[PDB]
Amino acid sequence: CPLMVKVLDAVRGSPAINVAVHVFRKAADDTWEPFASGKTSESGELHGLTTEEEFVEGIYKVEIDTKSYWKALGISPFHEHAEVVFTANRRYTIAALLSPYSYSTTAVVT
Amino acid sequence: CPLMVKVLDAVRGSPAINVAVHVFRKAADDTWEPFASGKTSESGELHGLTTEEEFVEGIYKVEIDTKSYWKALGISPFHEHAEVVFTANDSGPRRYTIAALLSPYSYSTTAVVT
Amino acid sequence: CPLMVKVLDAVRGSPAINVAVHVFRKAADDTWEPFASGKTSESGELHGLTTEEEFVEGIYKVEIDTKSYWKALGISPFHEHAEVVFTANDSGPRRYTIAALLSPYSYSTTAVVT
Amino acid sequence: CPLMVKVLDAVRGSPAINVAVHVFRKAADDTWEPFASGKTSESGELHGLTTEEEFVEGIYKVEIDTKSYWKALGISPFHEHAEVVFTANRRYTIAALLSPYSYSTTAVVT
Ligand SMILES: Oc1c(Cl)cc(-c2ccc(Cl)c(Cl)c2)cc1Cl
């Protein structure tokens, strides 16, 4: 499992559950092609997005649908979504900590 | 000054100087059109990107070139850039301050709206 | 103005107004003695805590009363307060900006030193 | 395991390993008494600090020796340490994300 996403809610102190995540890889024409997607689990995590075979060097985008998450809680958020763009050159954990008007993201590469 | 960007360096405890910032607005055909650009000053701030008149309702993307910043300090960072995407002026003109706190493998962004 | 505190609210995207701040300095007997205190203004800032003359070398603690802030908004937060502990003026007088970004279960603090 | 600490390094994108952590409980005379301590493991985590029986309601302080961590990497840090003070009223994860001049802490309560 080379790529894992974890999403946390800073308002409620809890995993961010059922948050949609879309992963894209940059194609040779500088366009983003769909690569993987899912919804975070009860633990705020999304595993099994890809395999070592498929996860070749390249530029990836992870898009987290933070707007839909805050709207379900009745809170008006600022951002349309959160995006994390990085080059893969090798276990990657992308973590995001969400508030309505702020987010932080961190990469743990182990 | 309806749109301001402030960028700080969490490694050196200093403003992040000479950071390139590009702003885009989503077009009628869902394309990102260039809107404004600049570089942060010695105080880590970028003012003067736009005017009230030009800054109409829409979805904007503020792209901060964090990679070039870290590379020039001899650090190879994780992210290609930091992107902030938001709807602006939805219910009338607001002033927006977009702040970013930068580390090589992490960044935080906050908005202050008034 | 060698010591400044800026506090932002990540829930409302606004400065955090009327937040109590207490500063202490470590005494000769390793006790925290009161040094200065105040409340953040409408811009979330607290200036005028001290002067260059009074702000001598030492270990300082800036305690931000985040709990009272969240309670007054009807939120029961996790932390009792946010504490920032640092050595100041170790190699001559510096100016220190201590920034805090607040959420009910999380806070971040950054220092800008010049 | 009601109390867990996780510490991450934002400069290197890695767990913060061998970081000393001291936990204190507020005594009736408003003094801090030692409660538990240890060093984070390879995964930046510290488990087995206390038991359900011992972890009664009260005010706790978690102190993370961030200064010693940065000094071992040859980087001059700002803070003397990072402190997290909270009331326990029930699995608590305290996470800290460390930079030389900045830290963030978050509580996940599940
Ligand atoms: O995480 C932070 C922190 Cl702790 C502080 C700021 C910030 C914003 C505005 C100003 Cl004028 C300053 Cl001094 C700091 C931004 C972010 Cl994103």
Ligand SMILES: Oc1c(Cl)cc(-c2ccc(Cl)c(Cl)c2)cc1Cl
């Ligand atoms: O700012 C933070 C903080 Cl304080 C903690 C995390 C984080 C990352 C991984 C795990 Cl397993 C946990 Cl519990 C927290 C992420 C971010 Cl982005």
